[PDB]
Design an enzyme around this catalytic site. Structure first.
Site, short mmCIF file in Angstrom:
data_model
loop_
_atom_site.label_atom_id
_atom_site.label_comp_id
_atom_site.label_asym_id
_atom_site.label_seq_id
_atom_site.Cartn_x
_atom_site.Cartn_y
_atom_site.Cartn_z
N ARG A 71 -9.84 -12.11 0.74
CA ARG A 71 -10.39 -13.17 -0.08
C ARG A 71 -9.77 -14.54 0.31
O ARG A 71 -10.47 -15.56 0.41
CB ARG A 71 -10.10 -12.99 -1.61
N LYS A 104 0.78 -1.21 0.00
CA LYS A 104 0.00 0.00 0.00
C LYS A 104 0.82 1.28 0.00
O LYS A 104 2.00 1.30 0.31
CB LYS A 104 -0.95 0.01 1.22
ZN LIG Z 1 -5.43 -5.93 1.39
ZN LIG Z 2 -7.42 -6.47 3.50
#
Ligand SMILES: [Zn+2]
Ligand SMILES: [Zn+2]
Ligand SMILES: [Zn+2]
Ligand SMILES: [Zn+2]
Ligand SMILES: [Zn+2]
Ligand SMILES: [Zn+2]
Lengths: 481, 321, 481
Positions: free
Chosen positions: C333, C259
């Site tokens: 996920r 990120k």
């Molecule tokens: Zn993530």
């Molecule tokens: Zn996440």
């Protein structure tokens, strides 16, 4: 009928009132002092509390916190803190009368009738004009009849600001190079008949060999106007003037060296330089200050087009120097290379120029103080002292050769609108402008960090700030006196 | 200066938190036997409740060392000192709030704060200046890892204040929240701290002058006059409440390592450090624009600059005299 | 002594009060009605006005706007609007008692004692714990003695939320995979002794062939914990359960597919999925609801390291399917590919799962409604009706094959954690999870747009939201009844 902003300080034996509220307490027979006790904890600085029905003719009475009675010049904040307490405090108060939708309000002088008026007036301002959804329009008069020309000095000083603010804030499709000139001329003329205006056009500019200003204008299909303001303040008209200069891009899109979409709508206030100084001359005429001032402002827009200014271009400033235009967003520097040259024509005493010039200034000080680079310590002091009174701070920055050097080397030309590197952003831009000035008392004020307010300055609501118009006006009062 | 320069310049795999301490101790000791060094380790730091410094160190597998320098210059040893403090990240990669690869090799000189001031104490000992000086420097590295400092974290500084660590590259502020607290232990006269703290300083003045924010006009003058002699300029910057305010509001904690907005970069970082200082004559010198030379300063070849070590030394000569 | 939040509606002949304030007016002998007239314009929805000294034991009395008396279900906003008026309105009121630093307050039932309590309690919450600088801690009790178990239902429902909120909000160095498990177990156990907790470790997870969950955990040096919650609500314990599942990344840095620093501190609330559902089970145990519920939550962190999960990797889920891990930030996920498989072990009726799964959901609906994809229209309706009562909306989204297709093609493996293209973001992520589920009544709730509040939901202060914990609790009450 109407509302009342009253004031109170912080503890002694019982936290005292500004005498007007001591007096209003006697009047509702102790029932203000008494309900303040019943309400809760005491009111520290610029905190507010509204008391309904205390008086027959004052249904809502807001008591605001003024802090310490003897609050004065601060060595660290470099301001008069008292004045600052009072501005945030009666702004607070006035914004409470106004949410109650009381169309008028009487304000407690709070020991400094000017700080009270600069708080009530800067505090309440919006630019409601294009919203059919507007807040109530509240008239703010002094409470009392003793200290009247200082309150009117607050109203004057804060109003010269709200003009820079409206002149900034208006969408640049309404606020053009022609419309700004027109409102400034109507404002300067209502201020003093001892004035002249010249909304000089492209033919005059062309004639004035203003190639740098003119290169910038050509991208847009909106007309350039070089504005010229005259205030004949002195007794002998032949006194040399004090010339203010200011960049007036009505909208800055960056041009070919085009800006990113993120919040580019604020570029409508890249004419903040021309707005600031104009509003400041209008006020010295309103004040009828014993000095001849001259106002100079290149107005135009910076746009991309089939005939916009390209990267790599050598244009010629009025003074023979050529500029490599490597970045079309460095255009305020170019707009100002010619208005600064023309300033020496007038044979001035001080050449104060002002501009929303660089974001690096915003990275630097960022709305604390407005960066002012000056080859004049006298001029620096003069500005800095005005900053202490008004509260609209001004911080000195370096006009070192170090920086002229990075802008003075240039592949095609004599000067280059950006420097060799990313660093020292506001300093290279200011050392580029020094190249177009030979007068001993010159001062660049970069307004780009003080362009906007949010929460940082209390008595100013969110939006265009109109900073430092009052420091500037205060400097011309002290200089005239 | 050339010592701060070598101490800066050396690749941070050679110039560690332990090797810097070792060269500084050998340099301070050759300078004066009237000296003591303490290359204090993680156990001492842990013990000193230095949670903020320590949070920064934990990403790397390279040891933290809090360095402590003593120069006994005065006749009466009991004279209160002048404490220098300085940030010593041997290498700054930004951590989880990780830097871009573009020229990140220069982060080896994010220990420039610790280098500058150390080199300056070594010189006042070499000069044998009639003042007791104390040198303080958190040394560690800022790295990403399975146990690096994460965004959003509340850590505790020695002084009870908590910091929201919203950006792991704002770590010099954290390294300095604890060495600054420890500076008041020594009962000083002046606390000069120095750090390659923010690039916004570089955007600001950018190698002209080294930005110095100080709650002391006396201290400002004192620095500024030394700048005139040495030529290594120093420019004052604003330690206004205005800025404390943006760092003082905080979702989880008491202070936050970055401010609410992009603006006034060096000022928010300096108003965060004011929160860890209560001494009257304090001075933050942000060295991040003067970190490097190219052509700008003539008599300095291209590379780490070691600025402002001589202004600093000149100040201690004038203060001793 | 203490404060009072009273209420008033909008016009009839004279804008009426909620009966408690009609009654408090009679009590101070018309002087509340009378001072409200003297104060200014009338109080529209969730607007506030404070009246000092009306009562001897109620020094500050805040009157808040409740809007129209007969405000009801809205076909466009898909909520009960009345309840919503009352929440924003007594939140407003309670936040005013609290700035006055009155440590206690009595609240007007406002016609729905539960909406009043959900407003007073959600309204006042902060997470003050790591600031030595805290606001006053105000106790909010009902005003009156008539409608008591509905007010306690407000306090219950809003408190289950403030728990998800604290469980979300706490910095992820304090709120670990072990500490979350520990607070949830202490909270579930204080709620009902008819409960069991299992803070199952890496050895159990390893043993449960949870390769996908486990691949995610390995980057960090912080322990994984698979949490297992049991609420034995039914009479016959052998009733099949309703299993809640939820993603619990204590901190998400993206891993190797790392990120950007911009606001990454909010990733501490990527365990919002595990928080939401847990808080919701704690509340059905607090409610002692005639249903057996099971709570399942993978807890771990997503970090870069010498042994982090790399781009391109095939890992194996419990169910034999392999996943190409092309982006290490698509890890919820993966964490959920195994807890979902384990959910079928329990032989459930409904498998509700919840997760701060994708930002594209945030681009989609973005804090209006929480997107819920379900292969069950029954389940959809069931959720959507609860949304109308609670006000915490939920919007249906598409679990079309269209999307399984883009995730089902894969160079190395059986499924791929991201889809072939940028589009339909929340839909590909939900059609990837459908691949790990074979139960008929499954529902994915993507919580990523409702993760945070600012100004959008009134009675919730700025920060982690804990949404949709009350819709979820309301669904289990209706399902148990
Ligand atoms: Zn993530
Ligand atoms: Zn996440
Ligand atoms: Zn520009
Ligand atoms: Zn511009
Ligand atoms: Zn850093
Ligand atoms: Zn650093």
């Amino acid at each position: 009928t109407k509302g009342l902003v009253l004031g109170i300080y912080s503890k002694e034996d019982e936290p005292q009132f500004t005498s007007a509220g001591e007096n209003f307490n006697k009047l509702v027979s102790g029932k203000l002092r008494e309900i303040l006790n019943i309400s809760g904890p005491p009111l520290k600085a610029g905190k507010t509390r509204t008391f309904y029905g205390l008086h027959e003719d004052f249904p809502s009475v807001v008591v605001v916190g003024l802090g310490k009675k003897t609050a004065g010049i601060d060595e660290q904040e470099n301001w008069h803190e008292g004045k600052e307490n009072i501005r945030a405090a009666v702004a607070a108060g006035c914004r409470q009368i106004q949410d109650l939708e009381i169309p008028s309000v009487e304000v407690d002088p709070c020991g400094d009738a000017q700080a009270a008026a600069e708080g009530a007036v800067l505090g309440l301002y919006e630019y409601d004009d294009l919203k059919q959804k507007r807040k109530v329009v509240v008239s703010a008069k002094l409470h009392g009849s003793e200290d009247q020309e200082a309150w009117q000095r607050g109203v004057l000083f804060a109003s010269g600001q709200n003009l820079a603010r409206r002149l900034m804030e208006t969408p640049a499709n309404e606020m053009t190079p022609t419309k700004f000139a027109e409102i400034v001329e109507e404002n300067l003329k209502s201020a003093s008949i001892k004035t002249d205006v010249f909304i000089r056009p492209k033919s005059w500019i062309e004639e004035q060999e203003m190639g740098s200003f003119l290169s910038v204008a050509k991208g847009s299909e909106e007309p350039p106007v070089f504005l010229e303001i005259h205030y004949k303040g002195s007794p002998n008209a032949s006194e040399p003037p004090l010339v203010f200069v200011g960049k007036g891009i009505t909208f800055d899109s960056g041009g070919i060296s085009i800006k990113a979409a993120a919040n580019m709508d604020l570029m409508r206030a890249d004419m903040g330089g021309a707005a600031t100084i104009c509003s400041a001359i209008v006020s010295a005429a309103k004040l009828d200050l014993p000095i001849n001032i001259v106002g100079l402002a290149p107005l135009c827009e910076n746009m991309p087009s089939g005939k916009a200014n390209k990267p790599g271009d050598v244009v010629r400033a009025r003074n023979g120097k050529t500029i490599q235009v490597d970045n079309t967003d460095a255009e305020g520097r170019l707009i100002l290379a010619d208005a600064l040259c023309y300033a020496h024509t007038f044979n001035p005493k001080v050449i104060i120029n002002a501009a929303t010039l660089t974001g690096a200034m915003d990275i630097a000080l960022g709305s604390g103080a407005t960066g002012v680079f000056t080859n004049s310590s006298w001029l620096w002091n003069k500005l800095f002292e005005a900053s202490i009174e008004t509260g609209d701070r001004v911080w000195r920055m370096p006009l070192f050769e170090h920086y002229t050097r990075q802008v003075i080397d240039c592949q095609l030309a004599d000067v280059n609108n950006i420097g060799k590197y990313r660093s020292a952003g506001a300093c290279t831009a200011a050392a580029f402008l020094k190249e177009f000035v030979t007068h001993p008392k010159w001062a660049h004020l970069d307004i780009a960090g003080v362009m906007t307010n949010k929460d940082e300055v209390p008595y100013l609501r969110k939006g265009m700030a109109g900073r430092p118009t009052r420091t500037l006006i205060e400097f011309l009062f002290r200089f005239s006196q």
